[PDB]
Amino acid sequence: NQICIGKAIKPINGTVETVSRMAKVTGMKKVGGERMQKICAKGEQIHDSSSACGIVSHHLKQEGCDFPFLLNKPKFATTGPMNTSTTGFNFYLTEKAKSWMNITWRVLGENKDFGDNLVEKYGESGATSEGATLKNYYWYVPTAKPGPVVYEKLAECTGTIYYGALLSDAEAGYIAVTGRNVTERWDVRFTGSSESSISFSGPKQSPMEEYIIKSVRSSVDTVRNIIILDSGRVKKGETFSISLSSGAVVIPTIFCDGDFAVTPQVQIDKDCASDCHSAYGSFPNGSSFIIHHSVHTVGSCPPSILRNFDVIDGYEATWEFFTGGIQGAIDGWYGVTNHDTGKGTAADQTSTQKAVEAITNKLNEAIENGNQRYNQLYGLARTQAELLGNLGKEVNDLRLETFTEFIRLETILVNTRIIEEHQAIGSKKKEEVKRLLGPNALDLGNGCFNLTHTCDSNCVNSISRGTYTRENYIHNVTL
Amino acid sequence: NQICIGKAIKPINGTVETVSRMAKVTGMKKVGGERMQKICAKGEQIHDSSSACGIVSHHLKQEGCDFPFLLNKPKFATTGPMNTSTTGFNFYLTEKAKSWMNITWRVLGENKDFGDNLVEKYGESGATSEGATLKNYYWYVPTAKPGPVVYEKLAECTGTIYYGALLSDAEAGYIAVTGRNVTERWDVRFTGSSESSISFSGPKQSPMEEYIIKSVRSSVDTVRNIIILDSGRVKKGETFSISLSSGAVVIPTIFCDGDFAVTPQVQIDKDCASDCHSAYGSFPNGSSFIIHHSVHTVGSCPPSILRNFDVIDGYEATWEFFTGGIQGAIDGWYGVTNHDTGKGTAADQTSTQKAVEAITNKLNEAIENGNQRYNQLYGLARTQAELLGNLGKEVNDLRLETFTEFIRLETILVNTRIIEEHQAIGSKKKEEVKRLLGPNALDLGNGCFNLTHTCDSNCVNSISRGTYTRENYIHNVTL
């Protein structure tokens, strides 16, 4: 008779893309994990103050709004919109200040305060009765006005600082506080990692009239003071400077960069745990990549891609007379048969184990390469707050597109590598079988060996374990 | 005798580049189409007003210059340079305003007007006798001056708006119109998709003196008014705001984004039609890509690349004793011979048809991939006007370089895939021939089969159409 070695015939599950062709495979999966329909927040605390506080109220430490100063900060937080009024004075924010305040109120790090340094350098802060509820502000009102100074300080962390002015909308109060003429225009300048500036004038002159018109009015209608704020950026090891004159104001806190909380936009479900969450749902455990449109997430999360890709999970179907496949059912991926089905077909676990190990190792190497590329693209020392703030109002990140293209190319390369490794394993197994069999028989060049004798089911079964011997099968002659 | 199957010998036309090697091929073509030496403008209207109008005159709706308000806008348009004087007042434009006005005067979309809203909100516009020829402007001159306000409106389309001031160069007129003091400095601010601002002062104070010196004088030498203009951007669904004081001016029209006309720079030829045009010539019909240095074009145009690449159009020349080639001439790419030339060599159309179909399908898949990459690079909702305006004075687009590199890699991949598919077709044909022939004969391992009998001229022809039978050829024995 004769024997053959090959793969187990299984239904074709799909098609994957290699470098030079498309291959039909018996099994495939997806590299990235898909978003769920809810947020699994078991074991996590949720902060919600949308009915009592606004974004600005948190920065100024209003009574009952102290998220940036909590000892333990919840990963999920919600609050009122940007235009929510406070109980103190009226406020105005620039566009840059709005963009950065959308983030800085919910940073999960530890914030640094430098109000005591200002107090000891320039004396006690100015006092007004309209800001009794708020606490976190320093008002520079020297005895001799305007009395310009430049305040320099070495920062303790990378972050943002809000500065500006606090002025009345009446001419008498403005003159009493600033000590300038109404027709004059003056500036407050900030020099840190970058440069920022803001201009002020009298209540009936530009641009202060526009500030008055555009300001957000407070809950108390008798309050005349408006606090106008801009933002500046500071680096950890460098020094920053602020040009101060009478009437200038500064919030004496550095809002350090890092992770910041996620505002839930979908249903929050308890009695369900996870480790990677986003504003629109959680992700399955142990994902190599996640299908997300941003880098903002909480918990332990992998890199994000914009779309999913298919990777091989089985083996190529290289079959339609022997054509490499084995009709008989076997418990494995490779087998030895003698055209007898039911008991004369035996499978070898060694080749299947090798193929599974090859798939695992190639996938691990691919994931490592992708992580290295992600680190190169975004940087080793990166923070989500800084990236999101620098993006600004833009919702499209080009680095995500570059990373997605790289991941697609990597997936194609992985499919190619896995297929080639499987081919090498099969060729090595065939060569080993030919070596073990003997030189007497001849090879048909397709994995089937014709023996000089008859090979019963026991002869086939002995070959798979490798204990086959030629002595007991020499009898009789056939071709 | 014996028979052989193989490819038709043809002269080598060139060399293409694959992933792992360079392959010699009998035919190749180019992916992209080349620019022509003229513009084919049959069936298209051409606008030319360079002898009577300038760029600014079109925006202000000067008598005889109304391109942005035409019902049907020609695809080709020419007009005077930016420094062309108008018949109204003198004008001054910022650098950003100049850059955006180079584009906005020839947008092919429909522009939105909001002058009636301004009139009903604030009353009739201010009137001067020096602007009788121009129509498209609103001059905010309230009864009580300065009377600052903030005008907010929800936009109807994404586009640009030109704002600023309209002031005299005499102190008396400036004081009468603005109602301010000459020593004061005031601002006009625009808040839309971004932020813009511009400053004004008295005629003898900075920066108004520089505006007077740098202004473009009008045709009438008795005109004292100067209109100073800056630009701002608005998004479709969002609201925009302008800070207005007495003396401020605004052009009450949103110049919507989209396609804009092309100014011809080469000879215009009628009696010749095309569908893709550029400023330096037209392009051939039905091109997958065009060799262009920008994304600005009119008509139906494909993506543009910076240089051309070669793609395979024939088959690889895998020949220098039989070496895979067939000496005898045949009407196809594949054939069967018996070392007899003239009638005993027969060609099979099936393999040639399969190879041509493979080339076509691979090229189509490549073009689809390139289109997807282009959409990812530039965005699904993109307009030529916005891209060109954001580019500014820069003439080098990095996205074009990235796309060209991607297209080069794609072309290499396509060559590899086509060559592999041709190899697979050839191997399948050889296996089918071996199966059809029979087990009696032996294979030399190079596509040539030695028969046990003689194969005459009719025997070769019988094999080609697949009706070959063994019964009538068993007679006689040879090796």
Added chain:
Amino acid sequence: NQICIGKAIKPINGTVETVSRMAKVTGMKKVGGERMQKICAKGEQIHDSSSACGIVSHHLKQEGCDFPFLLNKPKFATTGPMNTSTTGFNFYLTEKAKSWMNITWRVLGENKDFGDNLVEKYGESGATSEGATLKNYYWYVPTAKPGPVVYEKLAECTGTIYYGALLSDAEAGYIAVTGRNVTERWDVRFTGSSESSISFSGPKQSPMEEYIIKSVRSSVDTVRNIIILDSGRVKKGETFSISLSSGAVVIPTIFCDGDFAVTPQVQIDKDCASDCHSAYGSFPNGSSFIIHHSVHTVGSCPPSILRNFDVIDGYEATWEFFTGGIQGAIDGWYGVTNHDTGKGTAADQTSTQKAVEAITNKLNEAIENGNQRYNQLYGLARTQAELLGNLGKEVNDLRLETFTEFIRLETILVNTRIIEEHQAIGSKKKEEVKRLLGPNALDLGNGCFNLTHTCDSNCVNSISRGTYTRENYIHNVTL
């Protein structure tokens, strides 16, 4: 007997990465050259003035500090820090001015002067006794003040120009020079390749008070004048304009772009020569790429990459019965044996020479492709000064990361191509040997040929040079 042809067995040196697998090779090297521990400055002059001059002193042509006006400019230069005082007036620089002055004081090109044009256009420059030591400045003080003008000039080279004001910190001097009121705010504007502006006011008004506080005091404590400077950029063929008023100042020199000197940061070693230097060490001669984190270098330097990669330098080890390897030692890479070691094994130099040439040619093509990609990424007409100035305070260049990724991919492709070419050479050699031998013998399909006769060592070496003939070996019969 029998003969075999194959590769010489050598110890495995390493593993390289190809497109679809990792290959074990007998030799590999690195694409890029590594930085040395010293600067080899034999035959080069070194400039050092850190004990007498500062950066600003060089621009103003202070007595003894004239690097930008030297006939021959040394490639290595050192000077005092930016905050070094001068012997003239006090100075203040904006952040942009500081960033550009860090570079422009050491440009190696020829600088263009236009002071004579200013003198002939507007008369003799204003004179003060506090600037007797400095020479390179023009002070615009007309007879009728303020007397605003706009100065337009066609540039001669691409570069930077420093402009601004020169004012006293006393009210009387400010009024006498400017001719303005103290409460007014005025601007100096620069229009070139981009737009720049700077604002001034009275000594007791913003922002001049901040300039006074932040200024760097001069060596002489009786000097009251402060020169406040900003920077602007000019292109070669275009015209630039400056808005000048009484009291404005401008440095009448265009600091042309190009290469600029390197400040040594490591030990300088003479009696040692090189052609590529950086601030932290030199590089070996004749390197295709250098491991550097920037594009700033002096001498003839190749493109820089951020990390090194391995390229093949030998051949793949395709061996563990004959398995393609030859046990006997030979003087080459390929050989012919008859299982007799010591004298019956002969090597062929043709295949080894072909393999070495293939390696060289593939590496050269790779280097050419990398150079083309570098030129596309950075531009054909580029200068180091412009790139470094546009980078600013950023120390991470993304184009370097893109180039490094491209070089990694290119190295993988080169390994693949070299291995494929070696395989082709081996297959061609085997086919030629089979053709030369004869049809009588049979092939075992593994590079070993069994002859019908015995083959002594003489029969073996006769094959190597190809003068083998069958006539003298027909005698005797064996299998």
